[PDB]
């Protein structure tokens, strides 16, 4: 099983190496026979003579086109005759590229910016992570004293935790009596032990969570300051920096450094991406966090280091669990396109698609288009681009709502309407499919390059789903659930690739067409859903529609909704298909992208309403939830308002516990750098005078008080607050806390702040106590 690929140089000759794990044994294969090459389209395939003589220089010698051969590949489907100009070394290519495309003999050149190791996998037909070799996974995390406004690498690395298939340890240089803590002599020794563990564990994949920017780099700094060689690579080499995308990653020559951050962050949205939050939002299980202030104190005054150590073994156990979690998919994905896990785990879906096409381009005899030129790329970034269709929602509260959505909408459209660059507006085709508004033409005679591949990807997926629900090997029934998910991810990525600025097979027309057709089928479904089955469409967004038969019975709706589906799928063309996706007892749609629904299991689903960020006190969070469940579970905005008013009142009559008033926030940096001085930032420097921690990494809880100046100068630590001595600013918690949280939901029903504010007495008119009035 191929783990990764690279090449060293010997005698000025490339020596591609293959890092394999065949039968528990790490093996390195060398191949001094592959050769760099570019393609040249000669207008006169005879000028190849004075053209194969050009030469350049990079580090002395004069690079010579060590060969040429007239090959017959094809371009965008049409025939073409180019020349394969071999070179002795990869580096020689940038040299002669600048030239070769100068001599009027060439019309243009192709496949010239493709990395040697990558060109190898493709051409050699090799696909990574192919096979079923047991890979050794090892996760690791580091804890340091580093903060923010300080030198990166200056503060020592306090601990180094790691975990695997069966073990979770912590290495530190201060005593802690715990079966899982390995006490050691010094920081240097900690690093030594760590280097030893990987030597003994010998992992194929080293998992980290943001190890690319934090762990490894920080580790490097320390190793250096302490004069130690970081022999992590299976060849004794050190972790190396490697530019990828627009960032700087880290690799380990003989192993695969898998950094979860890139993978996670791009497959799940979240307010922030702390290890804690992620572990929580993936397993539900919570994970306690320990902060700067704590850690520094425990390390200084050697007391309490037990919990600061558990946090550490916790970090590793987490990173490992997440790794096993996300590794299966990324691996199958790496298998899917033909590139190394290291690369894939850090790539965008667009670059993931590009890689796929490049090898699918070579499998067929298709020459690849080039990346846009710097100016092309620029005026492309400037060009507007299409997005998901969204229907202004119908207002009010609705019951018995069904959600219908298209299955693989864009991929389906790309396939059934043969939307591809090579089929766009060809002439003399027996048949065409025409994009709804933009009127683009697509030849239906021969399957387009992309549509062909996408069609096969989807057929191959059903295959999976079939051989899946069948077999009785749960482990397999799992591995292939992954293989089908990887295909799902990859296919859903083609739509956006079409508009990916740096894409070779870029085609703005295809993009617009897919969108217009999306609109057409959405509107068609919408049309017949209301005009024939008597439904009322409540909200549409990109793929799905929400609907209901106003006033109708719950079972009638479920029955007819399903009747409509089978009915419309008969009329929909090609692979276009709608499905009865879900049902909701009740729900409401505020604005585009902002709504709330609830299933029969009582499970609430919401978008753009619920307040998250710690920026909100529990009184705000709690009430909003009271409001949301009363309306969704019982259907009455009226009892919801009643609730809000009662809470607003309690806030005013100082009847709410200080805890449901505390707002927490961490100090991002020194309190001398803060421009905008919020409450905590002020409770920070306020305690700073009182001489205390104030280390950029700790959270300051606060409570605003009934002062006179701005909030800031009036907040007391969430503890320096004591009743019968403190009067919190109820107005603040009412006007800037509870009302905003609750009005996102009640505003739509017609409610206003005036309607929810409180006041013991209200001025009344005299006129009713008057008679001739």
């Amino acid at each position: 099983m191929i783990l990764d690929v690279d090449y060293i140089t010997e005698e000025g000759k490339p020596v591609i190496r293959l890092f394999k794990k065949e039968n528990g044994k790490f093996k390195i294969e060398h191949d001094r026979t592959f050769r760099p090459y570019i393609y040249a389209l000669l207008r006169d395939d005879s000028k190849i003579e004075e053209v194969k003589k050009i030469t350049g220089e990079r580090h002395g010698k004069i690079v010579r086109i060590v060969d040429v051969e007239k090959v017959e590949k094809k371009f965008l489907g049409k025939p073409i005759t180019v020349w394969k100009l071999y070179l002795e070394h990869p580096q020689d290519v940038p040299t002669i590229r600048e030239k070769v495309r100068e001599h009027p003999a060439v019309v243009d050149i192709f496949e010239y910016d493709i990395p040697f190791a990558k060109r190898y996998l493709i051409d050699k037909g090799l696909i990574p992570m192919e096979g079923e070799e047991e890979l050794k996974i090892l996760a690791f995390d580091i804890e340091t004293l580093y903060h923010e406004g300080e030198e990166f690498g200056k503060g020592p690395i306090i601990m180094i935790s790691y975990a695997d298939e069966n073990e979770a340890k912590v290495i530190t240089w201060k005593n802690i009596d715990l079966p899982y803590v390995e006490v050691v002599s010094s920081e240097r020794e900690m690093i030594k032990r760590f280097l030893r563990i990987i030597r003994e564990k010998d992992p194929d994949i080293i998992v980290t969570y943001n190890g690319d920017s934090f762990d490894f780099p920080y580790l490097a700094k320390r190793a250096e300051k302490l004069g130690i060689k970081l022999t992590i690579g299976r060849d004794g080499s050190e972790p190396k920096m490697q530019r990828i995308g627009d960032m700087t990653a880290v690799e380990v020559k003989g192993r695969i450094h898998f950094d979860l951050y890139h993978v996670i962050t791009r497959t799940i949205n979240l307010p922030t991406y702390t290890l804690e939050a992620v572990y929580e939002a993936i397993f539900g299980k919570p994970k306690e966090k320990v902060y700067a202030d704590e850690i520094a104190k425990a390390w200084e005054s050697g007391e309490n280091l037990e919990r600061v150590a558990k946090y550490s073994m916790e970090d590793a156990k987490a990173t490992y669990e997440l790794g096993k979690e996300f590794l299966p998919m990324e691996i199958q994905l790496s298998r899917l396109v033909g590139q190394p896990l290291w690369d894939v785990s850090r790539s965008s879906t667009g670059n993931l698609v590009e890689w796929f096409l490049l090898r699918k381009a070579y499998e067929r005899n298709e020459v690849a288009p080039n990346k846009p030129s710097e100016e092309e790329y620029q005026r492309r970034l400037r060009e507007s681009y299409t997005g998901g269709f969204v229907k202004e929602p119908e207002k009010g509260l609705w019951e018995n709502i069904v959600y219908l959505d298209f299955r693989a909408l864009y991929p389906s459209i790309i396939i059934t309407h043969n939307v591809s660059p090579d089929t766009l507006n060809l002439e003399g085709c027996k048949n065409y499919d025409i994009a709804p508004q933009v009127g683009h033409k697509f030849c239906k005679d021969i399957p387009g390059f992309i549509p062909s591949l996408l069609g096969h990807l989807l057929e191959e997926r059903q295959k999976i789903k079939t051989k899946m629900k069948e077999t009785q090997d749960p482990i397999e029934k799992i591995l292939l659930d992954y293989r089908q998910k990887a295909i799902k991810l990859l296919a859903n990525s083609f739509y956006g690739y079409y508009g990916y600025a740096k894409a070779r097979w870029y085609c703005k027309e295809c993009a617009e067409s897919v969108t217009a057709w999306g609109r057409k089928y959405i509107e068609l479904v919408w049309k017949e859903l209301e005009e024939k089955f008597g439904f009322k469409v409540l909200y549409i967004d990109t793929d799905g529609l929400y609907a209901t038969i106003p006033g109708g019975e719950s079972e009638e709706i479920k029955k007819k909704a399903l009747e409509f589906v089978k009915y419309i799928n008969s009329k929909l063309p090609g692979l276009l298909e709608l499905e009865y996706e879900g049902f909701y007892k009740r729900g409401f749609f505020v604005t585009k992208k902002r709504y709330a629904v609830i299933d029969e299991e009582g499970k609430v689903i919401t978008r753009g309403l619920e307040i998250v960020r710690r920026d909100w006190s529990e009184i705000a969070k709690e009430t909003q939830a009271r409001v949301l469940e009363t309306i969704l579970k019982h259907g009455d905005v009226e009892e919801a308002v009643r609730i809000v008013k009662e809470v607003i009142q309690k806030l005013a009559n100082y009847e709410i516990p200080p805890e449901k008033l505390a707002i927490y926030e961490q100090i991002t940096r020194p309190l001398h750098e803060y421009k905008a001085i919020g409450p905590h930032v002020a409770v920070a420097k306020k305690l700073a005078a009182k001489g205390v921690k104030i280390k950029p990494g700790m959270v300051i809880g606060y409570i605003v008080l009934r002062g006179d100046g701005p909030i800031s100068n009036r907040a007391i630590l969430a503890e320096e607050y004591d009743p019968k001595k403190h009067k919190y600013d109820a107005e603040y918690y009412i006007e800037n806390q509870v009302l905003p949280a609750v009005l996102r939901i009640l505003e739509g029903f017609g409610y206003r702040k005036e309607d929810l504010r409180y006041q013991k007495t209200r001025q009344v008119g005299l006129t009713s106590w008057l008679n001739i009035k």
């Binding site: 009934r706 007495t761 209200r762 001025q763 009344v764 005299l766 106590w769 009035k773």
Partner: protein, 247 residues
């Protein structure tokens, strides 16, 4: 046309000043029986009634009944010039204007233009109040200003031989209990416990121009309007009917 004469232009001045902090214009009904003016504040929360029988003027000659609408602020300016022992003369003729003379050491005559004023016909109610109190302008002016620093509403509470005035602010509060022995309270007569709240801002304009020795009679009821009467020359009477703040 008429000719009315009042002895003591300062006391009269103050009267108008008082019953004018809430209004800009007024129509005065001059009849053989006396002078009367009735109006409501712009918000229709306070009713102002002024009754001045002929009995309190040293000279009272009213040929033909008349109602003359005047701009109160303008009028106030003129009367502000009257001294304690100055005699006030009000002369109305055929022309559309009122002649005012502050007679004394610096005798001078001012001309005031008569404007039209929307005369909203409304009578003065006979409310079944349950509590009556007689207080001094001082205590009352104090409590109202005191309360205006903490709450926007002040609460009146009266039980037999006891009268309270309190208000709740965002941090601190105010409260004042009076009994027959505070002499800020000259008389008290309730029939049942009586509570009611009112707007500090309306009571403010109503007690603004009250001397410290001035005496006022307040009558109210639970969740009901409050009545305040100031007597002028014993028979003349200034009444305010103030809508309550209900909880």
């Amino acid at each position: 046309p008429f000719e009315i004469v009042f002895e003591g232009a300062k006391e009269f001045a103050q009267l108008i000043d008082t019953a004018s902090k809430l209004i800009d214009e007024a129509a005065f009904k001059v009849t053989e029986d006396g002078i009367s003016m009735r109006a409501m504040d712009p918000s229709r929360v306070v009713l102002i009634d002024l009754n001045l029988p002929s009995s309190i003027f040293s000279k009272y000659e009213v040929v033909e009944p008349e109602t003359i609408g005047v701009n109160l602020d303008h009028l106030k300016k003129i009367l502000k010039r009257g001294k304690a022992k100055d005699t006030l003369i009000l002369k109305k003729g055929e022309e559309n204007f009122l002649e005012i003379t502050i007679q004394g050491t610096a005798t001078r005559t001012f001309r005031v233009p008569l404007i039209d004023v929307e005369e909203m016909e409304v009578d003065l109610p006979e409310l079944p109040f349950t509590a009556k109190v007689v207080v001094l302008g001082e205590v009352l002016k104090a409590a109202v200003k005191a309360a205006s620093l903490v709450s926007d509403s002040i609460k009146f509470i009266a039980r037999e031989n006891e009268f309270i005035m309190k208000a709740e602010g965002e941090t601190q509060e105010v409260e004042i209990k009076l009994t027959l022995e505070d002499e800020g309270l000259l008389d008290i007569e309730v029939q049942e416990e009586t509570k009611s709240a009112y707007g500090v801002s309306y009571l403010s304009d109503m007690v603004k121009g009250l001397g410290k020795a001035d005496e006022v009679t307040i009558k109210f009821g639970n969740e009901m309007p409050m009545q305040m009467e100031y007597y002028i020359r014993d028979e003349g009477r200034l009444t305010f009917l103030l809508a309550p703040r209900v909880e």
